[PDB]
Design a protein around this ligand. Sequence first.
Ligand code: GTP
Ligand code: GDP
Ligand code: GDP
Ligand code: MG
Lengths: 430, 430, 50, 439, 200, 152, 71
Amino acid sequence: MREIVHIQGGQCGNQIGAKFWEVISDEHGIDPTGTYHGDSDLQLERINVYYNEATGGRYVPRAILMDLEPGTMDSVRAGPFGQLFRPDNFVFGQTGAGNNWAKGHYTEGAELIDSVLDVVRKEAEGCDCLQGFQITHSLGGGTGSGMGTLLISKVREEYPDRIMETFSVVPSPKVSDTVVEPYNATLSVHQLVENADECMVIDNEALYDICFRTLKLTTPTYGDLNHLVSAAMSGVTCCLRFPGQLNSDLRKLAVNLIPFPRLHFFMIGFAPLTSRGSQQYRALTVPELTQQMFDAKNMMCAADPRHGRYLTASALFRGRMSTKEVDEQMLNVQNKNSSYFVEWIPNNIKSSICDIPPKGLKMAVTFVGNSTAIQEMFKRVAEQFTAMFRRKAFLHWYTGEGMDEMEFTEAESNMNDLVSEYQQYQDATA
Amino acid sequence: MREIVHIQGGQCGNQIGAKFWEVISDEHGIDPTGTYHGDSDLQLERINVYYNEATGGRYVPRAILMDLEPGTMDSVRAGPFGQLFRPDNFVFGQTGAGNNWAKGHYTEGAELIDSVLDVVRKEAEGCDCLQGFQITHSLGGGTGSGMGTLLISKVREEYPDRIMETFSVVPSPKVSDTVVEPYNATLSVHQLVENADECMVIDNEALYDICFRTLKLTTPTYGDLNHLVSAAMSGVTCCLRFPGQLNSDLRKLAVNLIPFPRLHFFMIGFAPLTSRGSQQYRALTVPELTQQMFDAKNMMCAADPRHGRYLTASALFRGRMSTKEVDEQMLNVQNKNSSYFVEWIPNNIKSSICDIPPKGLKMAVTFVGNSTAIQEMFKRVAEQFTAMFRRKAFLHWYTGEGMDEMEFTEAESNMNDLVSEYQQYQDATA
Amino acid sequence: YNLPKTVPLLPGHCFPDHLKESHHKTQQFTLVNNVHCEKTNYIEEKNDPY
Amino acid sequence: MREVISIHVGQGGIQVGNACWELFCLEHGIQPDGQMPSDKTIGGGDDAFNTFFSETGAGKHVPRAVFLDLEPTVIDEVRTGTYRQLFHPEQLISGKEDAANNFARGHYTIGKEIVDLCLDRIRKLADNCTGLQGFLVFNSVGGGTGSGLGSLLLERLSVDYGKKSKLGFTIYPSPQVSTAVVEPYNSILSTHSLLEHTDVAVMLDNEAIYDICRRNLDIERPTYTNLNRLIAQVISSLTASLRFDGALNVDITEFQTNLVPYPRIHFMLSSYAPIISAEKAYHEQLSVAEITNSAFEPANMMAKCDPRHGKYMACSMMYRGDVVPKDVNASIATIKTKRTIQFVDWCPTGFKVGINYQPPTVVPGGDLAKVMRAVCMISNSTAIAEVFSRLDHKFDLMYAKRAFVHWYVGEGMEEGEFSEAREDLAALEKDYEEVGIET
Amino acid sequence: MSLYGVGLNVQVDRIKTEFRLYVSKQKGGLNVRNLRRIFEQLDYQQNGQLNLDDFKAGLNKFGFFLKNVDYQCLLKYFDVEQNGNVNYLAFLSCISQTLNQRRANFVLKVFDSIDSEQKGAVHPFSLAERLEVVKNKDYQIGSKTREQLVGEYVAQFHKNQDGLITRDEFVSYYEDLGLGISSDQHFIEILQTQWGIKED
Amino acid sequence: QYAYDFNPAKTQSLQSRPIEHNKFSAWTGDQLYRTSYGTHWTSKPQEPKTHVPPGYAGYIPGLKPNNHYGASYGEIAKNCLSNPKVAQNPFKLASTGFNYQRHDFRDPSLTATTHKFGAQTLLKNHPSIDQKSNQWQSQTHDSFRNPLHKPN
Amino acid sequence: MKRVKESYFREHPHWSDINGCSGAKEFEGEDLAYDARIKYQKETQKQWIEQQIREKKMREEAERNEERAYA
Ligand SMILES: Nc1nc2c(ncn2[C@@H]2O[C@H](COP(=O)(O)OP(=O)(O)OP(=O)(O)O)[C@@H](O)[C@H]2O)c(=O)[nH]1
Ligand SMILES: Nc1nc2c(ncn2[C@@H]2O[C@H](COP(=O)(O)OP(=O)(O)O)[C@@H](O)[C@H]2O)c(=O)[nH]1
Ligand SMILES: Nc1nc2c(ncn2[C@@H]2O[C@H](COP(=O)(O)OP(=O)(O)O)[C@@H](O)[C@H]2O)c(=O)[nH]1
Ligand SMILES: [Mg+2]
């Protein structure tokens, strides 16, 4: 009931789903072969949120995998849990975007949109009561940023009411992976801010800093990194699938997080995450959970949340816990840092409680809050953009596929306007 | 309730802290592993005064050890009882102090003090009702008195009410432990007078003097000297931990020992201490306790107390003993040495009772007195400092990190100002 | 009566030991890339067919 | 021939509604399955269950309850748990989409497709009843779902039926302990819904329940489950006079004919006592003299409204236990003399005293200690301006910058509704303090 | 309290002062031996071990209350075999004095008068007659149920297999009443007042 | 007579203790047990559900996949949830996705092709033997579960 | 509702009980058991004390079993 289909694009998009599905199947006891092994009654109560049904007793994840180069989707079929996906559904091209936005957006990737939307049309109609589309992709990849962004624009116009979600990873300043990152990243958000109802940026810089400072793990790997997001991503929807004190769907979180239409970017994090050298000196109590859940070093976005003031936020407590100590701690959190919570919106914390904890732990927290500090990411990307454009370097590759520099100026103008408009409220007073 | 967090800095800060955490471990009967093996409830019902809690009933000392070099940090960990402190609590750099305040207050310590203030901030909020802070560090060390001083300034401005205590170890020129001692020590005092609520100074020379004369032992090691100081720390904070006839928390000792805010320096000591060849036939009664307590030579400050007049003093007796004989003795002392007590504060001795003696003995006491005799400790340092500044020898090191010549001139007056203002009351008459 | 079997902690009842065969120190603290990292002793299992 | 039907809307009501039935469930000798235990075979007497149940002609008693909601998660719990066989299988109306705290959503777009079923279901039960005395509505105003449908339901219930009384146990947000961020916006719009539609409304704010639980029950880790138990008791005593003997009884009708001075002001605060944990509950005398005093004690006012900041209009107190009529007279007179608790100038007599005989019952695994003397008061005081004033200020700050105003306008709610809604809240004040001026 | 050293003695030394003191003030029907027999109903196995809860309430029933700290103080030095359970046998081993020879001679001389046959064992009836005779003057020499009626005056003691009152026990059951009484003369006076026999 | 010893009670470190072993789930025996109901009547996880009335909504496992013949909603649900399957480990693959390397994922519905015909039969989802007309199942006089038995 | 019980402790008497009651010589209002009834309820209140506490204590140990088991 009120389930959501999954569409993921790009290699970074494919990988994230590669483990997000492995974890989610773990939570419901759906073995990689596809047969049931759950234990309680819950593992079969509301499983319609992500799983469909077919003859043979095996469960088919209702995912749509879209990559413009066959390498990624071919790989996903080899590793564990690489057999639950519908082989029929995969849509793949023949050339490759070559980390160029237009090539996978305007000429070819658009040319591929004929079939990919067709499968999606069938998928959405199948569900009784569709609840939204959660899209995961990378802004550092030309096709992923384009095909993902191109797909969103078509989808939104087709379902004006159904909610829309996005997981975007923006390149950090220090640890960069692409030389053309400033262009595509800046010119693609423009496509996201107008159509993307929700966004939760993830910074690859943040992960490594958390990896060495939080996990104390000697040899992290991209397999591990994909896990942190995978668990957290489940946090936003986890309470939707299982009974709890105060049910909170994806709609309600959107209800209490976005003040005005044009600010729909959030920064999130996951806790508790205790390294193996010190799990046995700490104490697992509700106050201990929150002191790590609003702290800077655990957030998923490299922007420091203390350089600005929060507008509103929601915390989705997970596990069996009683509220009275929850309310006191939260009211304690907000009322101890009046400089970091805008003064015109009282009672600026949301609360949600769900009973099932992640397998092996009792309590944890997933955070989603639109903080004005996010301007640092958008500001830094905008600046690096101005450096490259003034010399029209790297321009010919993009200008050779329809789009010219005229749209660049429009995007930068809109990009600046959102940046400034974001800070107007920070200095606003009652 | 009313817990206090111990934060120490420097090799003296660490080593002194190392034993002090060991001794307090044994009084409550806590084994190195951290599990409880106590006998009577008297050792747990108030154990929260210094300890947090965790899963498995394992206690972790709420310590914050800070240093600018690893060498001192490495040693304490490898020894017994070093497994109590948790990893995340530590904070350290990679450069070194270099016996320089300038390296300890403007350039190096600043770039790392942010974290410690972050780590220290966690303990205060977690505990129910913070009772205060205690500081252990050496004025003869660069970062020790240098960086730890910065923590004092930052902490003071963050909580206007909490009590502040500091154990100090000034370097006597007799044991010239560092030729650069005079500048830092004179520099150090300027910060300590304006901020620290209470200050407790100890002279190395006495400790060596105490070891050779009273204890009468062969080959002292820095372990032993660190031992006497450790127990002394137990005396001041003892009363709040165990039930007794009269309660005396930390703030009460201040309330009745610092006649004016400008004079908050004390001299401490421990008794009894008898040699193996001297304990055989020494009596065990109150009269012997006070006889050694007010003795001139046992005090742990190089300046001999009797050269001046006592302003105020307090006595914190421990263990069972008739309240009468403690009261009568104190009356006895305030009459047989009339010339040694100031005139305009009659009955200027404090006494207290606690019902648990340290393991192995029957009667013990910790003394704390603010005597005008401390003017010697500054005067020797004060005269010392002026001698080597008129030639500005060694001046180039401090001036290498932004310090201005005015600062040194300024520090001279305040420390000079205190010396003049301290002895004015000595000649005052009613 | 109940006599103790070893001397308890006190001012001079330790004044062992400082005259041992060899004194070696192992660096348990190392600073890399502005992140604290330390050794992993005292937590080592041995082995198993699990 | 005297029955009352319960109408529940919203998750807050569902949880509080779920718990409220067990207290009745264990109070009439009915096991969960729905029929008397097989151990007691003496035919059948009593008939006391007729007040809250209907005879099915064979065995099980079907509660005269109706549950509504727009999100099925909470409702699914009841129909799958151990209470599966009790509730009527088809009157647990369930939705398919949630309001998401959009007071407009449940009042203009989605509720229209569910308002029909609820009205059809309720009208059927009214036919079965013969002496229907009144309705009871439980809801929470901190969520749109309760605010929306509940607001719509009452508007329809005051037209079709006419002169039947109605009782409203609403739940406004706590002063500063808030779960949502948009509650102030939809909280005010809800006020106009029951301002002129509900005969009697009961203030039962949350934060007070926590206060009572901590200082009296001696629990440092309370949860929603224990919060409900106190509220269900309040329902227990109010209607307790309808299904047991008494030498001086008060029907549901005889509360809003005495506790509402004027048609406008009809909100009365509710307080309960005693609340003493078994660890010490019976280790004080528990005499009637002390029980009444705690009724007027400022700290146990189950609503977070300071009663000493206003005059007392009129109080009707229900006594259940072993009270002898002399006990009520001796204690009541003392309170009047008090100079710390005063009564308005033009209300000389302001006590309506009732006596009931059936003792309060203790649920297994509970906190309340089974005592033999308890008191329930439902009093209206001018102090209620405190809660209304606070909700007024919070509204002003946010609306100044037109924050969040978009969604309640884009769902189909005309932006103009706010202009009129705010005035009534201001209008409500000026009459609350006008009546407080002595002649 | 800080029972690291002789403290186990000091805490035990003092606590016995309070308990023995309390019985002396009562001095009446409350007898130490009652506690000796009381604990059997709590043992449930005759092993002599009882949990923490059982021991505390039983002492509460008799009418002696102590500090919380002591109860663990009692537990440690009487938890001989490290079970966490106190041994009432040892606890009853204490609070039982040896007896001063002033009483012993008064005890044994009285025993000599009772056992005129020098056999060493007392028939229950003979002790019964002397106790009742001293209380009444016209009690008459004969009755109907002298044995059963006058026996209930006795059997607070216990007999051996033969059924007579053995020398060992009879002395035992007069000292145990030596804890509730703390006056030497009045302890003596009890004997001749209850016996009409006084020689010292 | 000796020096000072550290360890009291001689508590050997967990390092040298025998071995890790299968007691991991000593907590997750009551971990999957709701508290919205629960703690009202029982304390362990709610037992498996055997009956549902109309309006239950969420995913009775057997309804949607295989089209069941017409019947009362109470009766149809009973057959699916009261039968075997929906359980038991046919292949023993663990949930954690580790038994994956043990298995092969092989299907016995193959042969060969080319040089004649390339269709191949269908997989094991195929009815047979049960071939029997509609009127066979529905109509019989009393050989069924008595509609109103309910032993007392 | 109705009124059957004059007082919580005693019911209306059987007709053979009120032999007189023609004149105000009997009133039954002095209880005459007030000492008795108060004495009875005293011990009765105790049992509910003991029962709840012992039940309450047990739930604590199981509560300690959960968190410790977590350990
Ligand atoms: N006292 C009490 N209040 C509750 C309870 N459940 C919910 N609430 C109140 O309800 C408010 C939030 O709305 P909910 O009642 O949880 O849900 P709702 O009103 O139905 O709105 P939706 O969640 O959209 O359906 C909170 O601020 C609580 O104060 C409860 O069990 N007890
Ligand atoms: N954290 C993380 N980032 C990834 C992963 N895979 C890809 N990325 C990001 O994606 C960017 C390159 O994306 P790209 O392959 O060009 O996207 P495409 O053009 O749509 O195929 C890099 O900057 C990476 O930061 C992953 O597994 N984890
Ligand atoms: N008595 C004693 N003094 C110590 C000890 N450790 C350090 N000190 C004093 O500390 C001073 C040097 O400290 P230093 O290393 O410069 O501190 P740093 O600036 O923190 O590195 C010397 O004068 C010593 O007297 C100790 O264990 N015992
Ligand atoms: Mg809801």
